[PDB]
Design a binder for this molecule. Structure first.
Ligand SMILES: *[C@@H]1O[C@H](CO)[C@@H](O[C@@H]2O[C@H](CO)[C@@H](O[C@@H]3O[C@H](CO[C@H]4O[C@H](CO)[C@@H](O)[C@H](O)[C@@H]4O)[C@@H](O)[C@H](O[C@H]4O[C@H](CO)[C@@H](O)[C@H](O)[C@@H]4O)[C@@H]3O)[C@H](O)[C@H]2NC(C)=O)[C@H](O)[C@H]1NC(C)=O
Ligand SMILES: *[C@@H]1O[C@H](CO)[C@@H](O[C@@H]2O[C@H](CO)[C@@H](O[C@@H]3O[C@H](CO)[C@@H](O)[C@H](O)[C@@H]3O)[C@H](O)[C@H]2NC(C)=O)[C@H](O)[C@H]1NC(C)=O
Ligand SMILES: *[C@@H]1O[C@H](CO)[C@@H](O[C@@H]2O[C@H](CO)[C@@H](O[C@@H]3O[C@H](CO)[C@@H](O)[C@H](O)[C@@H]3O)[C@H](O)[C@H]2NC(C)=O)[C@H](O)[C@H]1NC(C)=O
Ligand SMILES: *[C@@H]1O[C@H](CO)[C@@H](O[C@@H]2O[C@H](CO)[C@@H](O)[C@H](O)[C@H]2NC(C)=O)[C@H](O)[C@H]1NC(C)=O
Ligand SMILES: *[C@@H]1O[C@H](CO)[C@@H](O[C@@H]2O[C@H](CO)[C@@H](O)[C@H](O)[C@H]2NC(C)=O)[C@H](O)[C@H]1NC(C)=O
Ligand SMILES: *[C@@H]1O[C@H](CO)[C@@H](O)[C@H](O)[C@H]1NC(C)=O
Ligand SMILES: *[C@@H]1O[C@H](CO)[C@@H](O)[C@H](O)[C@H]1NC(C)=O
Ligand SMILES: *[C@@H]1O[C@H](CO)[C@@H](O)[C@H](O)[C@H]1NC(C)=O
Lengths: 247, 48, 144, 48
């Protein structure tokens, strides 16, 4: 009695990750290939993916999905990635009549009951248009200058946007007068060997805060807050700068 | 030749040296290439 | 702490071309990326370009799109920056920096029936990591 | 490959070159370790 049992399905936001499965019980796994078919509402079944000794994909997959077989438990997986909202359908599991895979629906003899996989984000996760999409043109805002008595505590605020600071780490640079810049803080929670622990940093939302204790004359310099990210060029921005003056 | 270090993922006082985190070189799909891989072994299955 | 040398600057007319050379010592140049930062006198910093360890991935800023070219030579441990279509606003100070990720070797060449021999590196992973910790003295470039 | 030399310890005249003292690298129980060993081989079992 050849029987096919599946898993997976359910809601996921657009661009999410889902994995489906389907095991074979009543027949030898290494004698037959497997395939995935999806039937959109009101449409006909179309080939999605299938693997015997070679993986094959549908014309609409565009390299997003990935099929594998694990002979240990005789199950075929389908690592769905970058799930666009047009992929919603009922996904079937089919056992081929041989070791080979056909793109037609009549190259298979045993079918699964079905499994609805739906995605209805409708662009809610992204949307772009300034927020996330191209980041517009965001420039960090910093106070013009700060001043405090020697040995006191000073705070520097570096507020930007969600993409540059909110969604990415922030690094701080110190530029002494007539001297090369030096790194002090990287990803807001670590310092190099050459910098003492007198400098502390933290982040909250889209604003970064730097805490300096035991300020001295030698610390008089210009501080810059910078963010880097290869995903988007807008996140690569340098701060205006804060001037530290010790009375 | 493995290169093992103790596991310290919030261990308990009973399981102190009983787990070793080892890394070793293994051949890839091509016989002309090696790569570093790691695995966890119990203390009873390894010697110095 | 390693030694950084910056040279190749000078006074050139607008619309001309120039090349800047940055030398690397006391560290593996091939194992780190390179970046160029422009800072006018009395103004803030401005990232210009970034290059990966292997020179495949290239990044440029909006203000220097289509006119600034960056290339590296790991064999000579020398950095080449070609400038085209210079403008008066380009008069500023350029800083030479390196990366920090300390790229390693993913694969090594093997001899199956030996496997104890130290053979050269075959494949590697690295690049990007747009973070600078060591800044050189820089070079002064004038456009007028 | 074998590095071989004639064995001669007040050897009898009938055995001028019957035996060879051959040395060669060899693999140990660990793959990434080699060992230098030697063996005696009859001339009929080695070819230059
Ligand atoms: C899996 O395979 C890899 C490569 O095949 C092995 O990597 C080797 O590991 C050994 C053991 O650590 C290395 O030997 C030692 O390397 C030290 C540093 O070398 C690295 O850094 C220099 C630059 O500083 C590079 O030029 C070099 O290529 C390496 O990347 C050396 O400092 C050591 O020398 C010191 O000790 C010896 C005594 O052992 C003294 O005689 C010397 O004078 C000196 O004081 C030493 O040579 C070896 O370099 C690594 N090779 C590579 C290619 O990386 C892994 O070990 C292996 N894994 C296992 C588990 O076996
Ligand atoms: C054994 O080797 C073969 C050949 O390399 C492997 O097939 C390859 O699998 C990778 C993914 O693991 C495929 O990469 C993908 O290609 C699509 C093509 O559009 C691309 O869009 C994706 O972004 C991704 O790069 C690759 O194409 C595929 N090879 C061929 C010729 O199609 C196979 O996975 C290996 N098997 C094991 C068990 O390692
Ligand atoms: C076959 O060849 C091997 C390798 O050359 C010989 O092994 C070595 O033989 C010597 C004596 O012949 C052993 O003693 C050594 O003698 C030197 C003499 O200066 C001494 O300085 C050393 O301290 C040591 O005592 C030596 O241990 C041995 N080496 C090994 C690894 O076994 C072997 O003798 C040859 N046999 C025949 C039958 O030809
Ligand atoms: C080692 O053994 C070889 C094999 O017998 C010797 O080769 C012969 O040596 C005799 C005696 O000198 C010569 O007359 C032959 O012409 C050699 N044969 C060849 C093919 O060259 C070799 O001489 C021996 N060497 C030592 C040092 O004992
Ligand atoms: C294994 O055999 C090899 C090759 O015969 C030895 O390696 C080199 O051999 C040459 C010529 O005999 C020497 O000049 C080198 O000094 C040898 N290399 C080293 C690192 O010593 C090797 O000595 C032999 N033994 C082992 C343990 O590998
Ligand atoms: C388990 O170990 C991790 C370290 O990876 C640690 O962060 C965590 O706090 C530990 N769990 C508990 C309950 O302490
Ligand atoms: C690891 O565990 C062993 C217990 O077998 C202990 O002796 C040793 O001090 C621990 N630390 C290291 C670095 O090996
Ligand atoms: C002959 O060679 C053998 C080899 O072990 C040695 O024991 C013996 O003393 C030698 N005899 C003479 C007379 O050289």
């Amino acid at each position: 009695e050849v029987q096919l049992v599946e898993s997976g399905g359910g809601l996921v936001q657009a661009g999410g990750f889902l994995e489906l499965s389907c095991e074979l019980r009543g027949s030898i796994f290494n004698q037959y290939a497997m395939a995935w078919f999806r039937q959109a509402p009101g449409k006909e079944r179309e080939f999605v993916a299938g693997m015997g000794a070679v993986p094959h994909y549908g014309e609409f997959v565009k390299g997003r999905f990935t099929i594998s077989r694990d002979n240990a438990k005789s199950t075929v997986y389908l690592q769905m990635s970058s799930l666009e909202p047009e992929d919603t359908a009922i996904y079937f599991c089919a056992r081929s009549k041989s070791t080979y895979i056909s793109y037609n629906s009549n190259g298979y003899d045993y079918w699964g009951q079905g499994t609805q996989v739906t995605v209805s984000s409708g662009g809610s996760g992204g949307g772009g248009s300034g927020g996330g999409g191209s980041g517009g043109q965001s420039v960090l805002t910093q106070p013009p200058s700060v001043s405090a008595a020697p040995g006191q505590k000073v705070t520097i605020s570096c507020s930007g946007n969600t993409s540059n600071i909110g969604n990415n780490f922030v690094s701080w640079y110190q530029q002494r007068p007539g001297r090369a810049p030096q790194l002090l803080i990287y990803e807001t929670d670590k310092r190099p060997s050459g910098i003492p622990d007198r400098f502390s940093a933290s982040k909250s939302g889209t604003s970064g805060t730097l805490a300096i204790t035991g300020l001295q004359t030698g610390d008089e310099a210009d501080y810059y807050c910078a963010t880097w990210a290869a995903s988007l060029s807008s996140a690569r921005v340098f701060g205006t700068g804060t001037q530290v003056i010790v009375l | 030749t493995l290169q093992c270090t103790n596991v310290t993922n919030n261990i308990t006082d009973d399981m102190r040296g009983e787990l070793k985190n080892c890394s070793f070189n293994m051949t890839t799909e091509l016989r002309d290439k090696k790569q570093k891989v790691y695995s966890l072994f119990y203390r009873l299955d390894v010697v110095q | 702490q390693v030694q950084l040398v910056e040279s190749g600057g000078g006074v050139v007319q607008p619309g001309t071309s120039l090349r800047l050379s940055c030398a690397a010592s006391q560290f593996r140049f091939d194992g780190y990326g390179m970046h160029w930062v422009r800072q006018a006198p009395g103004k803030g910093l401005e990232w210009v370009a970034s290059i990966s360890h292997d020179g495949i991935k290239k990044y440029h800023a909006e203000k220097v799109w289509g006119r600034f070219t960056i290339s590296r030579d790991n064999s000579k441990n020398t950095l080449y920056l070609q400038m085209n279509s210079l403008r008066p606003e380009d008069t500023a100070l350029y800083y030479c920096a390196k990366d920090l990720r300390e790229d390693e070797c993913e694969e090594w060449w093997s001899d199956y029936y030996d496997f104890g021999a130290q053979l050269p590196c075959a494949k590697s992973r690295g690049g990007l990591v747009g973070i600078a910790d060591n800044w050189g003295q820089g070079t002064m470039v004038t456009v007028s």
